[PDB]
């Protein structure tokens, strides 16, 4: 069925995205040193800088992915 | 200058790369599915089920999110 085939290709695309960019997200978080106190400020300034050069679905979902990593990073620390 | 600005521009490159790498695949996948207004939600739920049968990470979720956007826009524009 095309549904299962599409799901399986999305899985490989997802894992490709994970592998390609997760270490880059790690490094960005290292440089940012976010805290619970500054996470919202940082996320909105990052988004502002991102969208200053345009918007497409790729940029939106990259921001959401990074924002989830940012929240989780702050959670697991402080 | 500011680290937040630099991170925003690095996400701009990443997002443009994700757009470049997979948008044609999403379009082909939508051509093969032939989704309509009435079956798109059930198509999306079965695809998501098929996707997460092999696990979950943030890359998989954002791929699904971006595909869902393309699916919705496709159905929308093609009924017009
Ligand atoms: C906007 C998305 C909501 C769309 C509603 O339509 C979607 O498909 C069918 C009806 O077609 C519903 O189906 C529902 O009723 C029939 C039974 C099941 C139940 O889920 C889905 O749960 C939703
Ligand atoms: C607005 C709509 C929502 C937008 C939110 C963005 C998408 C949300 C992502 C949900 C992902 C949850 O899925 C979860 O992914 C993370 C990160 O990949 C995986 O976690 C793994 O990678 C992280 C990355 O830092 C490591 O720290 C961790 O030790 C490891 O387990 C989990 O195994 C998986 O359970």
Curated annotation (Swiss-Prot), chain B:
Domain-related comment: Intact BH3 motif is required by BIK, BID, BAK, BAD and BAX for their pro-apoptotic activity and for their interaction with anti-apoptotic members of the Bcl-2 family.
Motif stretch (BH1): 50-69
The protein's role, per its UniProt record: Plays a role in the mitochondrial apoptotic process. Upon arrival of cell death signals, promotes mitochondrial outer membrane (MOM) permeabilization by oligomerizing to form pores within the MOM. This releases apoptogenic factors into the cytosol, including cytochrome c, promoting the activation of caspase 9 which in turn processes and activates the effector caspases.
Signal peptide from the UniProt entry: none
Tissue: Expressed in a wide variety of tissues, with highest levels in the heart and skeletal muscle.
Subcellular location: Mitochondrion outer membrane
Assembly information from the UniProt record: Homodimer. Formation of the homodimer is zinc-dependent. Forms heterodimers with BCL2 and BCL2L1 isoform Bcl-X(L). Forms heterooligomers with BAX. Interacts with BCL2A1. Interacts with RTL10/BOP. Interacts with VDAC1. Interacts with GIMAP3/IAN4 and GIMAP5/IAN5.
Short sequence motif named BH3, residue ranges: 7-21
Coiled coil: none
The species this protein was found in: Homo sapiens
Recorded family membership: Belongs to the Bcl-2 family.
UniProt-recorded name of the protein: Bcl-2 homologous antagonist/killer
Top-level lineage group: Eukaryota
